[PDB]
Design a protein around this nucleic acid. Structure first.
Ligand SMILES: Nc1nc2c(ncn2[C@H]2C[C@H](O)[C@@H](COP(=O)(O)OP(=O)(O)OP(=O)(O)O)O2)c(=O)[nH]1
Ligand SMILES: [Mg+2]
Ligand SMILES: [Mg+2]
Ligand SMILES: [Mg+2]
Ligand code: NA
Length: 328
DNA sequence: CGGCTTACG
DNA sequence: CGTAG
DNA sequence: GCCG
C-alpha cells in the first residue's frame, strides 16, 4: 500500500542501509526547503522499512510506491558499489553538516539555521560569540547542546516518569501520565521523553500544566521551560540524575481532556511520518479531517467520539497497528 | 498540472 | 519564528 | 520526487 498507515513498520527491519541513504537525501531536501522532495524520499525510505526481507536486486523495487527514477538509482548504486555518490557528496558537504548541526539545536529550525549559514556562521562557537542573535530558548539549547546530543536511554525514562507522576499527583489527584513518542513505539533511545497527561473526569485537566511545571520547578528539576498565561504543552529541559552527576534531558509534556486522549495519544505517539500519512490518508481517501484533538466529518459537520486508538483506526477503515508497528 | 501538515507556545 | 531532524 |  501507498500510505504508511496502511502497513506495519517495525522499529528494526531488513533494509537499514538503504533506508538510511534515502533519509539522508530527504533531510538534505528539507534543508533546501524542498518539502515535496523531502516527503517522497521519506516515504520511499519508509516503504523499505516495511518490507519483509532485504532488497538485493533492482527488480524487487518494481511496483513499490514512491520509487521512481531517482530513488531507484540510489538503491541501484548502493546494491552495485556499496555507496551512492550523491549521498556521499551530501554527507561531506559544508552546507549539510552545518544545517544539521544548527537545526539539531533546541530552538533553532531550518529557517533560522539557513539565515545563520548565509551570514557565514558555521560552528556552535560561532553562535556563542554572537549572543545578541539568540533567543533565550536558543541560548538554553546552545548551553545544553552537548547533553542534548547524548541519547536518552530507556533506563532514564522510568525514573523521569516517576518524578513527573509525583508532581502531577500533587497538582491534581487522579491525573495520569502516559509515555508517548518514540519510547512508546519501542525505541531503546531517543532525543527526548514525551508524556501525555489527562484526568478521567472531563474538564478537571484544565489549568493542570502550570501547576505541574511550578511543582517540578520547586523540586529544582527544570533547567529550562518557557514559563519559568494558561498553557497545555511544555517543551522543557529536565535535570536527570547520573552516576556522581546529572545530565540535561529534553522532556515534552502535553495535557489533553479525556474525551480527546485517544486522538492525542495517536498523534503524539507518532512516528512523525506515520501521523502525517495517517492525516493525509484520512483527508484524501476518507474525506475526514484528523488531528490530535479529534476526527471531523466536514459533510455532516460532526466529530467522531473515540474511547481508544482502536476506535480511530476502525473509524478510518484501517487495520489496527500497535505503537511498535508505527515506526514509519 | 496541483498536492504534499497540524495546533499550540 | 519555535516545538519539529 | 513522485502520485493521481
Ligand atoms: N506536525 C509535526 N509534529 C511533529 C514533528 N516532529 C515531532 N512532532 C510531534 C508529533 C510526533 O508524533 C511527536 C513525537 O515526536 P518526537 O519529536 O518526540 O520524536 P520521537 O519520539 O518519534 O523520537 P525521538 O524523540 O527523536 O527519539 O511529536 C513535525 O515535524 N511535525
Ligand atoms: Mg520523542
Ligand atoms: Mg518530543
Ligand atoms: Mg520545520
Ligand atoms: Na531545532
Amino acid at each position: 500500500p501507498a500510505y504508511a498507515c496502511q502497513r506495519p513498520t517495525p522499529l528494526t527491519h531488513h533494509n537499514t542501509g538503504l533506508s538510511e541513504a534515502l533519509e539522508i537525501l530527504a533531510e538534505a531536501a528539507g534543508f533546501e526547503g524542498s518539502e515535496g522532495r523531502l516527503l517522497t524520499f521519506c516515504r520511499a525510505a519508509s516503504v523499505l522499512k516495511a518490507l519483509p526481507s532485504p532488497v538485493t536486486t533492482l527488480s524487487q523495487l518494481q511496483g513499490l510506491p514512491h520509487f521512481g527514477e531517482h530513488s531507484s538509482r540510489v538503491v541501484q548504486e548502493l546494491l552495485e558499489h556499496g555507496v551512492c555518490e550523491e549521498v556521499e557528496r551530501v554527507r561531506r558537504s559544508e552546507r549539510y553538516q552545518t544545517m544539521k548541526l544548527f537545526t539539531q539545536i533546541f530552538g533553532v529550525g531550518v529557517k533560522t539555521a539557513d539565515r545563520w549559514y548565509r551570514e557565514g556562521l558555521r560552528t556552535l562557537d560561532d553562535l556563542r560569540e554572537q549572543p545578541q542573535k539568540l533567543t533565550q530558548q536558543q541560548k538554553a539549547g546552545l548551553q545544553h547542546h552537548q547533553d542534548l546530543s547524548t541519547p536518552v536511554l530507556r533506563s532514564d525514562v522510568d525514573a523521569l516518569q516517576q518524578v513527573v507522576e509525583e508532581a502531577v499527583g500533587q497538582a491534581l489527584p487522579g491525573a495520569t501520565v502516559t509515555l508517548t513518542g518514540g519510547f512508546r513505539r519501542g525505541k531503546l533511545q531517543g532525543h527526548d521523553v514525551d508524556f501525555l497527561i489527562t484526568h478521567p473526569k472531563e474538564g478537571q485537566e484544565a489549568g493542570l500544566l502550570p501547576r505541574v511545571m511550578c511543582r517540578l520547578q520547586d523540586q529544582g528539576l527544570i533547567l529550562y521551560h518557557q514559563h519559568q498565561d494558561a498553557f497545555e504543552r511544555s517543551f522543557c529541559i529536565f535535570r536527570l540524575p547520573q552516576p556522581g552527576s546529572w545530565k540535561a534531558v529534553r522532556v515534552d509534556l502535553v495535557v489533553a481532556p479525556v474525551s480527546q486522549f485517544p486522538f492525542a495519544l495517536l498523534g503524539w505517539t507518532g512516528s512523525a511520518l506515520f501521523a502525517r500519512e495517517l492525516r493525509r490518508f484520512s483527508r484524501k481517501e476518507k474525506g475526514l479531517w484528523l488531528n490530535s484533538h479529534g476526527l471531523f466529518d466536514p459533510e455532516q459537520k460532526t466529530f467522531f467520539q473515540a474511547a481508544s486508538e482502536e476506535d480511530i483506526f476502525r473509524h478510518l477503515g484501517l487495520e489496527y497497528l500497535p505503537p511498535e508497528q508505527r515506526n514509519a
